Design a protein around this ligand. Structure first.
Ligand SMILES: Nc1ccn([C@H]2O[C@@H](COP(=O)(O)O)[C@@H](O)[C@H]2O)c(=O)n1
Length: 205
């Protein structure tokens, strides 16, 4: 199925977004045709779960399911914070470029949150989740965003464009928020996706 909504972990740690800005600009000075493939400023996130929300009532149900997920996330983390380290560069088949979540204990916890997200949402009657294995990543570019490159001379991201950053520590994000976002509505003025609702992670209540 084709989702139109997702759970999003916003990656706003200044160091991370700044390092990605430098990455993106370095690529663009090498080949300015890649401009439209770059994800926009303010849009950086990790996708936690995809889903379909097809009317106003389901959207409101989506919001209720997100609220319910909150206590489940803190049980999984055992009264601790989740630290997401972002280090180096990967691609899905040269078509999507992303900063890679480093390996650690945090990876399994993240997977457990994603799986608990899917179950929480489905039990509310929401088509949520994918069959594909969950591979968290922080996208900085996707060629599908610039469909004119396919027709032009550009059918993959040249690994030479980012060679200087393949080992680069972008920084660490502590999980602080989960957003319910529209994939298709107009973005906020700050460049983030349209946000139906949000919950806080990692703070005193
Ligand atoms: N395992 C995965 C997970 C996501 N993807 C994606 O790359 C994505 C860009 O990443 P985000 O939307 O999650 O930032 C999607 O457009 C989808 O094509 C993939 O190609 N393989």
């Amino acid at each position: 199925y084709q989702p139109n909504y997702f759970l999003s972990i916003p990656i706003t740690n200044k160091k991370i977004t700044a390092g990605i800005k430098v990455l993106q600009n370095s690529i663009l000075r090498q080949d300015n045709r890649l401009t439209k493939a770059m994800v926009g400023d303010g849009s950086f996130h990790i996708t936690l779960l995809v889903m379909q929300l097809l009317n106003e009532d389901e959207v409101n149900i989506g919001t209720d399911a997100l609220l319910e997920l909150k206590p489940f996330v803190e049980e999984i983390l055992e009264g601790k914070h989740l630290t997401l380290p972002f280090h180096g560069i990967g691609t899905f088949q040269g078509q999507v470029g992303f900063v890679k979540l480093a390996d650690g204990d945090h990876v399994s916890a993240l997977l457990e949150i994603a799986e608990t997200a899917k179950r929480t949402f489905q039990e509310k009657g929401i088509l949520a989740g994918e069959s594909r294995t969950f591979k968290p990543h922080l996208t900085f570019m996707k060629l599908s965003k610039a469909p004119m490159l396919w027709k032009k001379g550009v059918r993959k991201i040249e690994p030479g464009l980012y060679e200087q950053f393949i080992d680069h520590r972008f920084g660490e994000e502590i999980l602080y928020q989960i957003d319910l976002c529209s994939m298709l509505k107009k973005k906020q003025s700050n460049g983030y996706y349209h946000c139906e609702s949000s919950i806080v992670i990692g703070e005193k209540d």
